[PDB]
């Protein structure tokens, strides 16, 4: 019984926190967009 | 006077920076590099 009390529970974590990490991976994809995008124009506003 | 000169120079250089960004993107896109290769191959054939 005690073993059961953890087994399914472990799967929960195996399906929960790791899952959030995958979402964070998608954020990294957004970071890749900064590689394919050169910011400009805002620098003139900032320096003014 | 220094602030005005710096701001004017920054606006003047923004255009050149954007032009350099566009040239860098074009080079990374692998669009115009083989012309020099063909010219140097023709020169090599002539030298041979």
């Amino acid at each position: 019984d005690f073993h059961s009390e953890y087994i399914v529970s472990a799967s929960n974590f195996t399906s929960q926190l790791s899952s959030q990490v995958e979402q964070f991976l998608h954020r990294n994809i957004q970071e890749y967009l900064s590689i394919l995008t050169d910011p400009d124009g805002k620098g003139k506003e900032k320096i003014a | 006077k220094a602030a005005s000169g710096t701001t004017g120079t920054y606006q003047e250089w923004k255009d050149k920076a954007q032009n350099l960004y566009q040239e860098l993107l074009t080079q990374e896109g692998q669009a115009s590099f083989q012309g020099l290769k063909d010219n140097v191959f023709d020169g090599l054939v002539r030298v041979t």
Side-chain angles (χ1 to χ4, degrees), chain B residues 3-37:
Chain B
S4 176
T6 50
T7 312
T9 50
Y10 182 81
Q11 274 77 242
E12 291 178 0
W13 294 356
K14 176 64 65 178
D15 292 331
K16 183 179 60 180
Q18 292 178 180
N19 298 330
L20 291 181
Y21 292 156
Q22 295 296 335
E23 291 289 336
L24 177 60
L25 292 180
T26 307
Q27 181 181 0
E28 292 180 1
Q30 303 295 334
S32 302
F33 188 81
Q34 67 281 351
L36 184 59
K37 290 299 182 181

